[PDB]
Amino acid sequence: GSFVGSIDQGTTSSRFLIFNGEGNPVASHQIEFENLYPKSGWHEQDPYELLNSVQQCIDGAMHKFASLGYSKENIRAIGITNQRETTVVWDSVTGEPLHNAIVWPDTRTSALVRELKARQSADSLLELCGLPLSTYPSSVKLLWLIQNVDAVKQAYEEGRLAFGTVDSWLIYKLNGGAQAERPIHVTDSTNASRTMFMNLRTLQYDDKLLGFFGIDRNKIKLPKIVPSSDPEAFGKVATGALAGVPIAGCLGDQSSALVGQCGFSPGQAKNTYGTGCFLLYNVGTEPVISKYGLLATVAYDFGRGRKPVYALEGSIAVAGAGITFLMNNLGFAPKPSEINALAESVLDNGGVVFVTAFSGLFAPYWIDDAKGTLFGITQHTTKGHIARATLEATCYQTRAILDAMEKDSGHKLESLAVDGGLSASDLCMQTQADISGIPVDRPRMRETTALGAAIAAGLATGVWRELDHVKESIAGGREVFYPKMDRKKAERLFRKWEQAVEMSRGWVR
Amino acid sequence: GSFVGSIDQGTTSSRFLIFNGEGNPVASHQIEFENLYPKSGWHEQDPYELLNSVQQCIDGAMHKFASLGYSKENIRAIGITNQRETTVVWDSVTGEPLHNAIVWPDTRTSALVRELKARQSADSLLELCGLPLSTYPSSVKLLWLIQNVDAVKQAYEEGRLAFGTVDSWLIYKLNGGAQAERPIHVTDSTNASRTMFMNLRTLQYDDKLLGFFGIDRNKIKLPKIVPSSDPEAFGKVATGALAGVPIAGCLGDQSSALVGQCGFSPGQAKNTYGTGCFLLYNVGTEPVISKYGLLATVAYDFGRGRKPVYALEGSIAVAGAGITFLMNNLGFAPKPSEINALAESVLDNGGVVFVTAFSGLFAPYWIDDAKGTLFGITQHTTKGHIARATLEATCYQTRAILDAMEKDSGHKLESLAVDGGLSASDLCMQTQADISGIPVDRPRMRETTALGAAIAAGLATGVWRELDHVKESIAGGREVFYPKMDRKKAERLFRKWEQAVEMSRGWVR
């Protein structure tokens, strides 16, 4: 068994990838699936559309895999990775879903999060699970279910209702659900840490957290928290083209990005660009709570005698959206490619700074009364300067989050891996290297998030045996940007950014 | 004699206009002439190019005037109006110019103005003449001449050198220069007040001011300060098509704009739009020094037993230039017409505010460490909002100067007349009415600056006999905008502007 499969069940799409030993994808398949928004701010998904989109991705990829004369036999194991926090409720005895899945960006729980943060008990939660209380974690979402849908009310107190993030849903159904000879209702530590039901230092459940939400361990059926890489806690695929192939890896998606970039040491960090950014920062083997609003979480739990590695996480709202703003709202250019050309048509930012706080700023500034704000404008300011400033703003925010991650962890920043969206822009990554003063790593193999789950599964089954093995194996079969700007001029820019942030406070009244 | 001529000798052009009794121009002619800039920041004009461009404008207009069967006989008098402060030196005995004319925006005197403001004596000058010491007034310019050109050094202490602003130069040469039977070397009070050599409360020379510059009344020949409207202190045209036609009016150009808009009462003000704005504010019959950096000056001196009427003046740097910035630097639109269309494609400014302090802000904020600054930006901000914000910014600055003019004068603002440039935009004038809460008057007859000099000449010669006569006469043969916005919402905008100004302080370091 030489190949490793990976399920990547995302927020808008599912894909299934088959990598070889060098970590290059050989067959693949991707499905954009249906996302339901009942009323504004509500975000739902049919749980069978997520399972079927994955299973159809397996079917199609295995079609192509077959075309190269390879079979089920060539795939030793598969890993799952999934959008996090999204919340699935099913009948623990029938396997049927008891209501739609509530996706992480859903805000229907906004009215409620007031009540629970209103309960004074609620602020040693942060050092218990790692997470500020949001509309985001699945705990708040599950609670809203057990108090607004009757089938969930009923099933719950009948000892009948099972819960899990998307990972555990997927693993349960792929093993055959309730009909399996060994029903698998498990979750990995990274997914588990996003619920607010698990204790970060334990990697198991904490009854104070279960208590605050009023979640009873004996009427709700909760997945056994297992490692992210285990040779048999995830069972095997029951049906389909991959019948009998064991599932040996499971990771929340952002952690799987970091694993797939081989950021196994403290100080190694990854950034994933889309409309905004997901920053993940490896902080080694003891949890680190954050002074700065960052989330503490599990990076990966590879078991096999080894300790779980934790991480800090921050997010940016306006990355790709700043580009989109220049295109749609100013008509600078039609496509991202040529906004990026605009930015390079000038030598520097001409003194322009663009605080892109369209919806305020988040980690680590936490300014809610700024709007987007553009400084440094003169008759000599051109489209190019603004375009460069807009790129630079995501670099400044990335650096601000990375700096905050240093002060929380005590580990020097060592490297920044990047993937997705804006990371395609040569100037923007070069500017990250200059501003942050470390090398910025951009792989050319496009599916690093799926690669992470493959890595966890390959380790549980011996495709790779050490993790020093893994980075060396994937490297076989531009890409790295180095700081060229002198540090003096690299620090006037960042201080010019911090002044600007300062000066954007208190705009709205 | 039924028609009135007007010379309008401007900064880039000269024109000559013939109005009828209703104040409508019947013939006209305009010459863009040569402007010389020896080295950067230096701005020179050959004095004979200004005189010849005027005389050629007379020749061409009289050609057309003749074509309608009218002659020299039909023109009872003419008025001069001219760019102010621009400085002419000529041999008091030969009439020949002793060096080029130094135009008002010339900054070669920058090195010097330090020395003279460095002389502690120099800050009861402001309440003596009305003027902050700038590179602008002709006093500083004349001094630089008498210390850097030898012909001026020589002619000066030989008792031979004569001086005058462009008005007096023009009047002297048109009367025949030194060859005249009655040489006319006169200036009107408004022009006189721009020199810093005249006492504002006297309307004559003050020897403390002459002293500080070291200007000796007996080696320099200075024009007799005369009224702006006098039936014989300006003599007559000697040569040309208008030979024998008396010159009976003379006004500095910005004052002539206000006269031509019929702002004869206190609280009536005019704004003239170009790249920036020239605001003039009638403050009645006693001078008013300014707490706020505004210039105190003579509005008009119509003599004939009547007291001289004074004014306050402020300027804005970025009016038309804000439009130009959107066109050239952002590519919003190709022409001003359609920047204005952009601004109307939206209902309001979408919360955007654009502090257009490209070179800082001047009256009355005096902020030198701001650059242009754009607030209120969200993903919903469109080109239209910014375009509206850019228009609104000149309205806010106009209102800030008008408000400062109220607090300096104690006279309520009563009306704002407008001409030139941006005043053509229906939205921008409507927005001035809403913001300022008074009616904004935009004539359709395009040459109000030339009209002012005609009015002064018509009064000295009885074409009109009262000034109540004048506004009623010109009105015969849109145009007025009224405040439509409720005052509540008109004052949130202006306070939102003042916050933004506040928040732009201290950008540059």
Author numbering:
A (entry chain A), B (entry chain A): 65 to 541, 551 to 582
Original paper wording:
Subsequently, by replacing the cryoprotectant solution with 20–25% glycerol, we were able to solve the enzyme-substrate complex with a clear electron density that could be attributed to the bound glycerol moiety. In total, three different crystal structures were obtained in the presence of glycerol, constituting 13 polypeptide chains. Generally, the same extent of the chain could be modeled as in the apo structures, i.e., for residues 65–583 with an approximate 9aa gap between H18 and B18. The substrate is bound in an evolutionarily conserved cleft within the N-terminal domain that opens towards the C-terminal domain. The glycerol molecule is coordinated by polar interactions with side chains of Glu149, Arg 148, Asp317, Gln318, and additionally with Arg148 main-chain amide. The carbon chain of glycerol packs against hydrophobic Trp168 and Phe342. A similar mode of binding was described previously for P. falciparum GK, where Phe271 and Tyr135 undergo shift upon substrate or cofactor binding. However, the movement of equivalent residues (Phe342 and Tyr200) was not observed in either of the presented CtGK complexes. Of note, we solved and refined five CtGK structures, and each of them belongs to a different space group, despite crystals having grown in the same buffer condition. We observed that in the absence of nucleotide, CtGK adopts open conformation, which upon nucleotide binding closes up.
